[PDB]
Amino acid sequence: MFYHISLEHEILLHPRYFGPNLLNTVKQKLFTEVEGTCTGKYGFVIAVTTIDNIGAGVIQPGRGFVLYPVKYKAIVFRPFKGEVVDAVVTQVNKVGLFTEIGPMSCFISRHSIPSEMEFDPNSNPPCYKTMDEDIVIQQDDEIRLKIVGTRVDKNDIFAIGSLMDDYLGLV
């Protein structure tokens, strides 16, 4: 589920930016620094909705940089294990299905693809289809998957999806 939360971040403003428009520069730098970044604790941050407060800028001894602790309201998304989430399949391969859920990308391993499914490599767009052809899962389709687990690496989060349970798969 998407979450709107207040986040704590410290802006080390370079002295050249002091004087007029300092706080505006802090706001601009905050967006620039936090937006487009991800953290294992809070996940991906989409946008800063507003800033709760700009703390008193502590001048760093020797560094000259001023450390501004900032509280800002932002929207984030984190995948939770043991939960069902709607997803869009991005790439289909014999190894598994790659899917996108907002900022997060989830992978469904072949072992987690239902027994009724089977990969159809001869098809021009790779897809998995059932023996009776009742449902077909391909790229850019509406599917629901179970978050088996969440992993984080290099400021990126990727989860494992499963379609074995009921009400899953193509919807």
Add this chain to the structure above:
Amino acid sequence: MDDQGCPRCKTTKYRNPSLKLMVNVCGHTLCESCVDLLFVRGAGNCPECGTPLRKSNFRVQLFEDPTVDKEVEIRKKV
């Protein structure tokens, strides 16, 4: 008490009588220790029969006869 043991792992029968058999569409007896083994790897197929299964596909059913186990589930479904 009466079951001599599961073909996969029978220690549970001698260990304690509180554990219950897990039924599958495979019509093949399996038990709780096997459940953990299939969750980590090869969740898609039976350990020996090779028949495909959707992850664990394990349900509690205490009959000793797997045919009755399967037929009772068939009974309800039918």
Add this chain to the structure above:
Amino acid sequence: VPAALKRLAKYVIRGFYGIEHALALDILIRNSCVKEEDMLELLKFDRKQLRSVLNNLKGDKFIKCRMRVETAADGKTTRHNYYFINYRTLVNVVKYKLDHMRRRIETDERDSTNRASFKCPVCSSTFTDLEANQLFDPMTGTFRCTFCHTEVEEDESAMPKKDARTLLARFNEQIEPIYALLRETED
């Protein structure tokens, strides 16, 4: 002393210990209490030979020892060590020793469940399927080892699981005679 206790003690001693332990236990079985000096002269064992065996019996606490002090006919002090079998601790320790195998056997099954599947053939390092995706290189499209910059293998992880499982299973099958003797001796 019910015969069921003697049979259990003889079965476990001859089953998981050497004949030295069995022979010493049979002496403590034939006679409720025997002096260390008597057992030494009878078994013809050396002091350290018998003492180490007795220390093992002391380790599993299957036997108890009491020390008696008296003055000999010539006036010299004498300290005799009287050993006897403690069926209560023996049955309790074997019950732990056997239920600890079950814990260890199921721990070995859990190990066979947790033993990482992927591995590097160069450095002979095993990688967990969770770490394998961390180690995945999109440029190559396959698993590789960061230290060796070489392909990572996955199929060889079935061999140790299969082999160990046979030992674990065969252990449970052979241990049943002692379990039956225990059920017969719980009282």
Add this chain to the structure above:
Amino acid sequence: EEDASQLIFPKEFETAETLLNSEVHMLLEHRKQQNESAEDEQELSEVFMKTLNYTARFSRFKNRETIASVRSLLLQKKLHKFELACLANLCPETAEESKALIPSLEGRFEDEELQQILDDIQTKRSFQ
């Protein structure tokens, strides 16, 4: 440590508010207008684009009044914000589906009450 099926979440996500994809889309659209206005400033990240595309496709409500009506009506019910967010976002067609998707939902409301709530949401939903 955290499990949605068990309704276990860290304190960091306890005082946090859950937003629907329709509501998140509204926020992103606001951020879009804010970024599109006052031209020549920093361009939006691909993370914004990816999230906007995803949340727009799954947006269950395209009208502010429907979101306010659903939010105000659901708040009346004795349901947790997580349960209401899942309910108003997933929008299951039947009570049985709602119980299947959310195992913690059982016992909160009766089948008729649960189905009636879902039916109301289906009526409140805007179909294209």
